[PDB]
Design a protein around this ligand. Sequence first.
Ligand SMILES: [Mg+2]
Ligand SMILES: [Zn+2]
Ligand SMILES: [Zn+2]
Ligand SMILES: [Zn+2]
Lengths: 66, 436, 196, 84, 49, 113, 263, 49, 133, 97, 140
Amino acid sequence: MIIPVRCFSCGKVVGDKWDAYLRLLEEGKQEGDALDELKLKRYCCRRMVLTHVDLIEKFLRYNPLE
Amino acid sequence: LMDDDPVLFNRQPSLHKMSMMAHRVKVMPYSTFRLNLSVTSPYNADFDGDEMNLHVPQSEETRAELSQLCAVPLQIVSPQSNKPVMGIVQDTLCGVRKMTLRDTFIEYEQVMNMLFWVPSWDGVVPQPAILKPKPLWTGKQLLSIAIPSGIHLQRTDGGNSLLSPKDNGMLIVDGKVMFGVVDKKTVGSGGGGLIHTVMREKGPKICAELFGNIQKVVNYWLLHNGFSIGIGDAIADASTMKEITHAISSAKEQVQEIIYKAQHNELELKPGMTLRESFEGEVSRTLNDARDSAGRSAEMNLKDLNNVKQMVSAGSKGSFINIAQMSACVGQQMVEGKRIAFGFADRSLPHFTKDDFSPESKGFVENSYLRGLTPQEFFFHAMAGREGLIDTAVKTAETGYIQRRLVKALEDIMVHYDGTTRNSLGDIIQFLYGED
Amino acid sequence: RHGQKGTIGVTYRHEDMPFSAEGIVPDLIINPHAIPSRMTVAHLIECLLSKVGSIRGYEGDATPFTDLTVDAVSNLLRDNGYQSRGFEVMYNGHTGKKLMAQVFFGPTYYQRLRHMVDDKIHARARGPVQVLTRQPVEGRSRDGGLRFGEMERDCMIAHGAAGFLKERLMEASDAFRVHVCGICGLMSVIANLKKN
Amino acid sequence: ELAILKEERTTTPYLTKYERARILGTRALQISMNAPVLVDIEGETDPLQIAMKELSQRKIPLVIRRYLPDGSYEDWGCDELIVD
Amino acid sequence: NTPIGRDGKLAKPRQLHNTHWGLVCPAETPEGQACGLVKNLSLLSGISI
Amino acid sequence: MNAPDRFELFILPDDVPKLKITPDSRVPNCIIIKFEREDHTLANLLREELALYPDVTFVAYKVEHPLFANFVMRLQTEEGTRPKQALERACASIINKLKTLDHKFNEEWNIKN
Amino acid sequence: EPKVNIINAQDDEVELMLSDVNLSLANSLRRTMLAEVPTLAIDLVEIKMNTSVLADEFISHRLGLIPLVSEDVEEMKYSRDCTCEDYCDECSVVLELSARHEGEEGTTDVYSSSLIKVSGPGNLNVGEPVRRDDYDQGILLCKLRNHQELNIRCIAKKGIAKEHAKWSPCSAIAFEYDPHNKLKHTDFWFEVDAKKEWPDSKYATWEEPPKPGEVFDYKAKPNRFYMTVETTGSLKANQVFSRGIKTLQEKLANVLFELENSR
Amino acid sequence: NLMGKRVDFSARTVISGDPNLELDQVGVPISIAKTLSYPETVTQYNIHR
Amino acid sequence: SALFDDIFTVQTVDNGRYNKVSRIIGISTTNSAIKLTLDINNEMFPVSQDDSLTVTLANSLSLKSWRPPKPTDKSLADDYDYVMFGTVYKFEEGDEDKIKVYVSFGGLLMCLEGGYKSLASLKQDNLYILIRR
Amino acid sequence: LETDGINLAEVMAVPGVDSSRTYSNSFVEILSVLGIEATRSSLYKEILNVIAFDGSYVNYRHMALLVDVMTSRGYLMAITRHGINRADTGALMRCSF
Amino acid sequence: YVDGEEEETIMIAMTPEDLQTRSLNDTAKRIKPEMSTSSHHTFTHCEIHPSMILGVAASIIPFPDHNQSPRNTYQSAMGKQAMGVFLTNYNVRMDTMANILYYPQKPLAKTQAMEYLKFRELPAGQNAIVAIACYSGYNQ
RNA sequence: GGUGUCUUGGGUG
Ligand SMILES: [Mg+2]
Ligand SMILES: [Zn+2]
Ligand SMILES: [Zn+2]
Ligand SMILES: [Zn+2]
């Protein structure tokens, strides 16, 4: 839905890295290199960001009803 | 409802009298029931969705009936096959096999914790098997702590001597294990094992407490030892792979020779059997023995540290066929007792040519699960599994009908005070029950 | 995704769970005794592929009937600085001592199924009865009772518990009182209890 | 007419599991209705355990009437059947 | 859905058949009394108009 | 709906003592201690501290159920020593060791700054 | 006798080797730092207007998971030990979040930096959401479109990680000992050779590998422990370590107190 | 309705395994322990409790 | 104060089946036809082929709850390198002068042949085994 | 010798055959030829064969009781309504089935 | 297109590589079948890809050719009961029951078919870190 | 103080 604040397994804060990750993917860096640069070293933290599906973009498309 | 109240506990279907047993209550949080794991065998239960019913007796007479007739300790031995039905299962087994190996040693601090974990421990620390240069206890000592005193057990496995080079067989003297790995043959539900012996000599209460003592000791030791399984436990080295593939090629050549003999009118028939049925029986024999030989090679390749081998050797899960199918060859698929029929015109699948009797055409799967099945082999194995699912889904109704009819036929039959076995009309069925 | 269903038996906190040398702790610990007799090798292969994909930052391809092999995946995994078969040295959470055996460790895709215990837990002491039979109604939502069917009766008969059976079928269910004529044996007796 | 004399009683001298269960249940129910207790109650308050104590000391004042398939019966006091 | 019905223990129409290849999924079928009677189309299956 | 509160792990009630000592009569000069609202963190520390004293002959602990936040500890000592006294001695020793550890860590951290 | 040797020391993490201590001590320290070091986290949320697509308790869970500066949290009181019938200014920190999208294009992101501390037991340095830099935007909380609004009053309280993971000052405490398996505490699974098939520990070069002529030693215990504490910014690494030590000290002092005053 | 029937004073829920229970023990949830009941006659041994 | 003193020459050592345990065979150097088969912990007392072991069997270490030994006390085990405690579970008073004793050291097994005059006093409940070199 | 089809009485007479040991797997034939006790023996043999085929072991007394109920009246009583409901028991038992 | 009846008369190559017999020795990759009985094959058709025989539910399974078929059937049944995000407009719909996972994650090991099944756009699971161990006995 | 009946389809054990 929206990026989780913490890593499930260990609890590192990954919620402040989604925008940097998107900008890194924009400038051509492949996913492993982007995750390396954000200093996500444990594969739990890495799969937190690598497997996220951002559905809030899809939910926001339905007009506010008030 | 409070602690130690007797309640009747039940899982459907109730196929035998040990599907409904009386338990003592212990109140706990969460919304799920809790069962000791050794009683999951008589219920035929597991923990992947199952539900069970609890009935509360509403008077003192029904409380006494439950506690004195239906209680779990009283049902350990069954009259169906005069053997125990509750045994040691899963980790407690695998763990006791690993713990009672000859080269398993324990230091003083883990020994102290394990001793304190035994509810019936009498507070006396046994002398260590090794006193110098460092006190070490063996797992056999710690397991012998669990067994009550006054127990003698003796088993011979393949004519072993009293010095047991393989550490097989079993000798128990005054409740202490002298030699022998403790596995399914000793703490399983088979007859003549340790559970049956303790039941017959000490009674149902001490036998019930034996399950708990052994479970606690082995679970602590396994918690601090560990046991796992990985993809590497199903992988055989190159030489065993060469042996397996050579055996499979030899069997394919044998099948091709049988095919040539049948086509040139040289096959030797069997009594009560057609030339085609003889041909099919001979081919099935050949391919089954091929799979068995490849499996034997794969099993021989496995080290004593292989985790699959440890689970099989403990007898807690899996068998030789599982190792064979995982590592060497899935083998031949059968649909309704026969090989894969020619569902298309003169072929099994439209990727074969007509009248091709080779093992690959009619459902022999040459690969293992590790290697992966081809699409044809995948489809044939799916057909066989579908046959199994249909059988499982469809036969249970006939079986339930048969058991209902048997119960209605025999429901009115009771042993009377004069020893006779009579029905509700008073007519004699047997002058003495069981003739003994 | 390989037929490996199960329910949660217990939950442990972060500090109680076993950890690897990198401080990674598992979300989930399943039992080894579900692999051998079920022969779900794809589960282990997929755990290995998922580990490699998460380490190298891509998604593993697990399409059936492709030319991928376990050996290539293990070569990649060892090149990434991990034991090539997915084993890791883990430590005991309670004591910090190493485990004597190494543990197959990695990510696996799990599913949250619709069956929750809180939608199934039901108890009934006394409650609504049926109009016709005066027996407990049927249904968890209606606060019903559980059926003590025929095979349950067979098991109680095998146990020889006659009193328990009578109490299940009478005082825990539709017990009633009727007056019969001692001469004609029909329940046609008109009774006025307040007038005796 | 249907009672059997104490000399020709040919049933087992041992309390069966069903007889023991019902005797204990009935005694426990009786004691829970403020009946007098024959044993010395030291620690236990549960009527079932008190009934077990009475059963062991052969002090339960009850009678088992064992019906035969022909309708006749034998009478055995609880104190004279043998408890294991 | 094949409307055979459960009145009859003929296991033949419940069976995965050779001609099912490519047309109906070899693995997806309900457990129990609908096993083999309720089928599921393969991804590239198509029904003529 | 049956889940207990997550603070009952550590918050001691007013009617529940923190610590309760009973003697083990089977062996001489031994005591059984039940620690309420504690877990392996204190238990393992105390156990491995006590296991290294010459006058302590037996020491062990267990957490009988993971869903209940307590542990029970069995501790025996020699004839002259009392197990209680050995328990205060172990507590004081671990306190001193932790204080020394803190001092050295602070000095190292300051130099590293 | 205990010794500490710091190998790397920055604000979020400290990597240190611990020596001349028992393994139980090191593991107790790891457990205490993971579970029993108090911090501050939002424990009570009050919704005024939430017209976002996200649910009220979804946003509440996310807000509870936001790290807050907890440097002075030890001078604060547990909300179960204050005489106040309702959290007073001294046992809680009150935060405000107000967000709103004006305009008919674009999406307004709601970040943790938008949280504003209103009250709290001043001048204690608690409560502020942790920023990485001066220009940090914090954690993503929600997203807002036209006329969607978020008006929230959060309460923050003192707690430990036993009660809920949101009070954990640490993410992952790496911990290991005996890189060369001299003590033989593990027994390596292998296919061909156990030395080739197992990667070396990252602290292998800190200890001498065993010589082939060497025999097994049955007197050696574990004596050197390599551990890397990491934080979420709520506390600093040295603060986490020192307060874990202090928490262990006070637990032991509690035990000592009960023993002496049960006499 | 006569050979089998629905009964009061019963409960049902998912089962779980517990290595720390005795063989003849079953763990009962608090909510079920409070919903179900046992009628206990008051006597001079249980009146205080 | 000992029951059976002797010196043995190790003949074969087959580690094979186990990793920390090896079975050794040894004939007495002074009185052949006295055979000894024994399982021993490798990591506590490594043994090589043709090595010479002084083996003692005793019913006590003096000159019921095990507690760790102090430095200050003394026992018979002070002069040896490898001490084990075991249970005699078979005394085979067999052929002419073949006498076999079977001892289980917590699952580590021992067999000892020889004439009756050597092993007559080895008919005990529990036996210590002590080893040098 | 093993043979397809069944004729016990006439094959039993054929010279060269051990007339005292010929056996049939149709116990109805046994009943018609050899009597009811031989029928009981054959019935137990068949049930034991079917059960113990796969290595399962059922204690003797249970199958003995089952075969004694089926041969108690002098003729083979099948375990069906057509067998069970021709007894002299009460109406309520028969209706309950 | 071919229906079941026409399939009787055709000779289908299983993969595009099967159209030519190769002359290997890979102990890991499975031996693609010899097909030696027939001297010269006259193929008329080729499969586009053999994995297309599976349906919607079976296509989620990773490496279904390494499993025994009953487990594939059980997963085909159980994957339909898995909490996910059935639709993106679940907030303007009013249904009797609905379950939405908080944080759906796409799988780390994926099949090609899920690109067409939208399983990566509307996932129904989470990648947990799993150890396989007999840790304390509560997972038996 | 009193929360109704029957069939169809999809699952869990
Ligand atoms: Mg199940
Ligand atoms: Zn992480
Ligand atoms: Zn009348
Ligand atoms: Zn306050």
